[PDB]
Design an enzyme around this catalytic site. Structure first.
Site, PDB file in Angstrom:
ATOM      1  N   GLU D 117      50.338  12.948  71.877  1.00 36.16           N
ATOM      2  CA  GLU D 117      50.897  13.905  72.913  1.00 36.16           C
ATOM      3  C   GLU D 117      50.563  15.503  72.839  1.00 36.16           C
ATOM      4  O   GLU D 117      51.331  16.227  73.540  1.00 36.16           O
ATOM      5  CB  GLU D 117      52.027  13.543  73.428  1.00 36.16           C
ATOM      6  N   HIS D 141      60.564  15.826  73.633  1.00 35.89           N
ATOM      7  CA  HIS D 141      60.423  14.469  74.134  1.00 35.89           C
ATOM      8  C   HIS D 141      61.460  13.599  73.549  1.00 35.89           C
ATOM      9  O   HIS D 141      61.296  13.658  72.162  1.00 35.89           O
ATOM     10  CB  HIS D 141      58.951  14.003  74.409  1.00 35.89           C
ATOM     11  N   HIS D 143      63.864   9.641  73.893  1.00 36.31           N
ATOM     12  CA  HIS D 143      64.201   8.530  74.955  1.00 36.31           C
ATOM     13  C   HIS D 143      65.526   8.561  75.024  1.00 36.31           C
ATOM     14  O   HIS D 143      66.499   7.620  74.277  1.00 36.31           O
ATOM     15  CB  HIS D 143      63.506   7.153  74.157  1.00 36.31           C
ATOM     16  N   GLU D 171      79.542  22.120  83.526  1.00 37.97           N
ATOM     17  CA  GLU D 171      78.332  22.998  82.804  1.00 37.97           C
ATOM     18  C   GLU D 171      77.069  22.943  83.285  1.00 37.97           C
ATOM     19  O   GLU D 171      76.486  23.743  83.043  1.00 37.97           O
ATOM     20  CB  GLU D 171      78.381  22.932  81.122  1.00 37.97           C
ATOM     21  N   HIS D 212      61.265   5.652  80.942  1.00 38.72           N
ATOM     22  CA  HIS D 212      61.013   6.177  79.432  1.00 38.72           C
ATOM     23  C   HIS D 212      61.616   7.190  78.899  1.00 38.72           C
ATOM     24  O   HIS D 212      62.067   6.918  77.733  1.00 38.72           O
ATOM     25  CB  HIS D 212      59.389   6.730  79.940  1.00 38.72           C
TER      26      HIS D 212
END
Ligand SMILES: [Zn+2]
Ligand SMILES: [Zn+2]
Ligand SMILES: [Zn+2]
Ligand SMILES: [Zn+2]
Ligand SMILES: [Zn+2]
Ligand SMILES: [Zn+2]
Ligand SMILES: [Zn+2]
Ligand SMILES: [Zn+2]
Ligand SMILES: [Zn+2]
Ligand SMILES: [Zn+2]
Ligand SMILES: [Zn+2]
Ligand SMILES: [Zn+2]
Lengths: 274, 274, 274, 274
Positions: D117, D141, D143, D171, D212
Site C-alpha cells: 500500500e 492504517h 484494524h 473530546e 476492514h
C-alpha cells in the site's frame, strides 16, 4: 547466597499478585493471598528477620497450624505494589507452638499487618489440609470480573452455577469436578463469612461470594492461580454468550459424563443431574 | 557461541507461548505448541543435550516423521511459565529412524513429558506435510476466547462458521480461503479427536473444537500465530456485532468473490455459496 | 544522592500516568493529574530547577495554596509519554506568597504549560483541603471507559448512579460511602465546570462528567488511583450485567446498611433510600 | 554518536507499531505506517545505508514527493515484530528527483519491500500535504477493533457515523471536527481504493474502510496515533452503549455547537445538522 527477596516464595508471591493485578482482578486493595511454607524454606534467611518479631494473638487458636510459617499479603496493601516493594506489602508469619497467635518474622514494614482476612484464610487452610491430606498450601482471593458479573444474572446456587461453568469451557469439569460452592452474600471480614467459606472449602476448591469475588485453594501458587483463571475464563466466555442472547448449543450432560469418565474424575452429582 | 536457550527456536517458542498467554488464550495448562525443526537447527547444541535421552514409544508409528526433531511444550505445563524456565516447560524431541518413538534430547526437566496431545500434533504434522509439500512446520492449539464463545451461538458447521469469519474482517478470506473445519464436540486427548483433527487438516489450516478451542497449522511460529490471531480477531468483531443485535450490513458474496479474484485464492465453495 | 527524576514524586507521577494509560483511560491527551507536595519534597533538588522560573498569573487567586508546590501533567501532553520523558510532560510548580500565580520550577521543557485545567484542579484542591483537614493531596482526571459508557444509559443523578455503583462491587460503599457526584454535561476547560466540580468536591471524593470522564481526590497517588479504579471496576461489572439483560439479583438496601455499619461509614442517604 | 536504530524516527516507528499491536489493532500483517522525514533526519547515518540502494518505480509519479525520504513498514511484515528487528521490518526510502520511483536506503533486509500500500500511502501524503500546507507527515492504517465492529451496525455514511463518534466522547468534535469520511467497501491494495482514500483525505484526517479498518493522517507519530486512538476509544464506548440497548441520553446538537465555539473549530455541517 542471596537476600530473601530473591527466594522462590517471595518471587512467587510477586508474580502471583502482579499477574492477578494485570488480569484486572485486584483494584485498590481488593484481594489477598496466603501461602503455607515449611521451616526449610525460610531457614537460610533467619538473619534477615526482624530482630524482635511482633506477636499477634489469634481470636480462635488453630493448633493444626502450630509452628507453621506462611507468606501473606498485607492489610490495605495493593496487589499492584507488591512487585515495587515486597517487604512493605508482604510478610512472613509463623504460628506459635500451640496455635494461639503468630510472630511477624519478616516484612510488613512501617507497622503493617497481615490481611484483615488472615484468621479466615487460616480457617480455610485448616479445612483444605484435612480435605487433601496436607497437599493444599495456598488460599487465594480476588475480584475476578466475569465471575462477579455472573452472580447478578445466574442463580447463586452451587449446582446451577457449577454446571454453567463446566459448559463454558471443556476443561472446567476436569479442573474442578467438585464444583464451585456459592455462599449467600455476607458482610466481608466477619467471623461468619470466614466460617461459611471454610465450611464450603471442605467440599470445593473454589468458593464464590456473590457481588464480591472468588476464593480458591491449591497445592502451589501456579496451580491455585490456574484454578481461579480457569473458572474466570469460562465466566468470560459465558458473559459473551449471554450477551449474544444465550446458548444455541452447549456441552450436554452425556458429554460431561463421557469427559469425567475419560479423565478419572467424579463430577458433582447435583450439577451433573441438571 | 551460546547456550541453546538463546537459539532462534527456543526464543521463538518463548515468544509464541508468552504472547498467547498475554492474549488470554492459555489459562492454566490450556494450549500446546509443536514446531518441526531440522537437524541443522539443533546440531551446534548437542553437548547441551541430556546425556542419556529418554525414549518414549509412539502408539502408532509415523515413518513420515522418521529422524525428525521437534521443540514441544510439556504436559501439564503453563504457557505463562515458558518465559520463566524454558528447559522445565519445553522439550526437544527427535523421532527415531523408523518413526516408532522419540528420544527427549533436551528440556522437560524433572521427568516432565511432552503434551499429552503429542501423538495427535504428530498426526496433524503428517497430514500438513502432505497437504503443503513439506512447507508447514507448526501445529498450535489454544483456547481462543471469542472463537470459543461463537461455538455456543453459531451453527457448528464448516461452511456457515467460515462464512461469518470471512465477513468479520476483510483479510480473513485471503488468510484462510480454505476455511475453518469444525468438528463435533469430542473428548479431548483421545485417539479419535486426534484422527478427526488430522482428517480436517487435510483440507484446512484451521480446525475448531466446539466449546474448547482452535488448532492451526503453518510454516513458521509467526505465520501460524498470525493465522489463529486473524480468525480470533474476526471472532472478536463478530461477538461485538452479535452483542449489538447483529449485522445491519456485511461483506456480500459479490465482494468476497471480487476479493478472492484479486488475491489469487479459491474461496471454499460451500462457505461462498451461502 | 540522585537526580529529581528518581524522586518518589516524579517516579510516582510516572507510574500513575502509565498505569492509567495501560487501563485504556487516557487516549491522546485525555486526562490530567496534580499532586500537592511539601517544600521538603523538592528542597534537595533546587539546583536542578530552571534558573529563572517562568511565572504564570492565576485568574482567581488562591491564598489557601500560597507557597505550595505541586507536580502536574502538562497541557496537550500524553499520559503515554510521561514514562519516556518526565521533564517534557511533567512540571513542578510553586504557588507564590499571596496565591496570585505560580513559578514553573522544573520540567515542562520547550515552553510547555500545565494542564489547561490547572486553575480548576487548584479549586478542587482548595475544597478538598477544607473537606479533609489537609489530608487530600491529589486531583486525578481520566477517561474511565465503563463509567463513561454508563452515563449514556443510567440516570445522570448522584443518588441513582451512586447506588448502582455500590451494587456493582461489595467494596464500593466502603470505598466511597459519600457517593459519586454527577454534574450535568458542561463545556470542558471553562471556569463554570471548574466551579461546579469544586462544589461537588465539597461532598464527594469522586465526580462524574457525563459523556466525558471522572474526577477523583485522595491523600496519595495510590489511594486516588485506587478510588477511581474501584468505581471503574464496578462500572465494568455493571456494563457486563446490563449487556446480559440486567440484574436478576443484587446487593439489597438491607445488605448495604449492614455493610456500612460493620465498616463504620455513613452511606449517602439519598442513594441508600432507593 | 549512534546507530540509526537509536534515531528518534526508528525508535518512534518501533513505539507506534508496538503500541498499535498491544491495543489489538494489528493481527498478523494487518496495518501499515509511513512517516515523511527530512534529509536532515537521515543525513548523519548515510554510511549505515545499503551500499547500492535498490530502486523501485512508481506506477504513477508523484513530483510533489520528489527527493523526499520516508520511513515505512514492510509488506507482509508484522507490527508485533518491529521491536524485535527494526531493520527486517522497516525501511527508509527516498523518492527520486522527478518522483518516478524510490531508492531503499536502509532496512527491508532479505529482499523485503515496502507495504504493498505504499503508492496509496503516498497519494494520501500528497493530498494531506496540500490540505495542511505541509504540516501532516504521517499516514497510519490499522484494524481498530471497535470502529470495525461499528461498520456492521451503523449506517456507513460520513455524517451519521461522525455524529455518533462525536457523541461517544466529549473530546471527539474537538479532535476531528472535520469528521470521519466513510468509503464504500472496496477491494484492498487496489489503485481504486488508494484514490478514493486520497480523495477523502482532502476533507478529513480520518477515513474508514467498512469491514476492514481506519486510516489517519497527522503531523507526528504521536498525534496521528492519538487521533486514531480517540476515534477508537469513542467507538469502544459506543459498542458498550449499543450492547446495553442504546443511548437513553447523549451529547445534544446544542452542546456540540457550544463545544465547537469554545474550542474554535467548525464542526462538519452535515454531521452537526442531524
Ligand atoms: Zn474481596
Ligand atoms: Zn544466623
Ligand atoms: Zn457445597
Ligand atoms: Zn485445549
Ligand atoms: Zn560435541
Ligand atoms: Zn472440512
Ligand atoms: Zn477530559
Ligand atoms: Zn543549591
Ligand atoms: Zn452531590
Ligand atoms: Zn488493512
Ligand atoms: Zn560518510
Ligand atoms: Zn467526506
Amino acid at each position: 547466597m542471596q537476600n530473601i527477596t530473591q527466594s522462590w516464595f517471595v518471587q512467587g508471591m510477586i508474580w502471583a499478585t502482579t499477574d492477578a493485578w494485570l488480569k484486572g482482578w485486584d483494584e485498590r486493595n481488593g484481594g489477598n493471598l496466603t501461602l503455607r511454607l515449611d521451616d526449610a524454606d525460610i531457614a537460610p534467611y533467619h538473619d534477615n528477620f526482624h530482630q524482635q518479631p511482633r506477636y499477634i494473638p489469634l481470636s480462635q487458636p488453630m493448633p493444626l497450624l502450630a509452628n507453621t510459617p506462611f507468606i501473606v499479603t498485607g492489610s490495605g496493601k495493593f496487589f499492584r505494589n507488591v512487585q515495587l516493594d515486597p517487604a512493605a506489602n508482604l510478610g512472613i508469619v509463623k504460628v506459635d507452638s500451640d496455635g494461639a497467635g503468630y510472630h511477624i518474622l519478616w516484612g510488613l514494614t512501617n507497622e503493617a499487618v497481615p490481611t484483615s482476612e488472615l484468621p479466615a484464610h487460616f480457617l480455610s487452610h485448616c479445612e483444605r489440609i484435612k480435605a487433601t491430606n496436607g497437599k493444599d498450601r495456598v488460599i487465594m482471593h480476588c475480584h475476578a470480573t466475569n465471575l462477579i458479573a455472573l452472580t447478578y444474572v445466574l442463580e447463586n446456587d452451587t449446582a446451577v452455577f457449577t454446571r454453567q461453568l463446566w459448559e463454558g469451557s471443556t476443561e472446567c469439569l476436569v479442573v474442578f469436578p467438585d464444583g464451585v460452592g456459592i455462599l449467600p452474600w455476607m458482610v466481608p471480614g466477619t467471623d461468619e463469612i470466614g466460617q461459611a467459606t471454610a465450611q464450603e472449602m471442605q467440599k470445593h476448591s473454589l468458593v464464590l461470594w456473590p457481588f464480591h469475588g472468588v476464593f480458591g485453594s491449591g497445592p502451589t501458587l501456579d496451580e491455585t492461580f490456574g484454578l481461579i483463571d480457569t473458572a474466570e475464563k469460562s465466566a468470560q466466555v459465558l458473559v459473551k454468550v449471554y450477551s449474544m442472547g444465550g446458548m444455541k448449543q452447549t456441552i450436554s450432560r452425556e458429554e460431561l459424563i463421557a469427559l469425567g469418565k475419560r479423565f478419572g474424575v467424579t463430577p458433582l452429582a447435583s450439577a451433573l443431574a441438571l
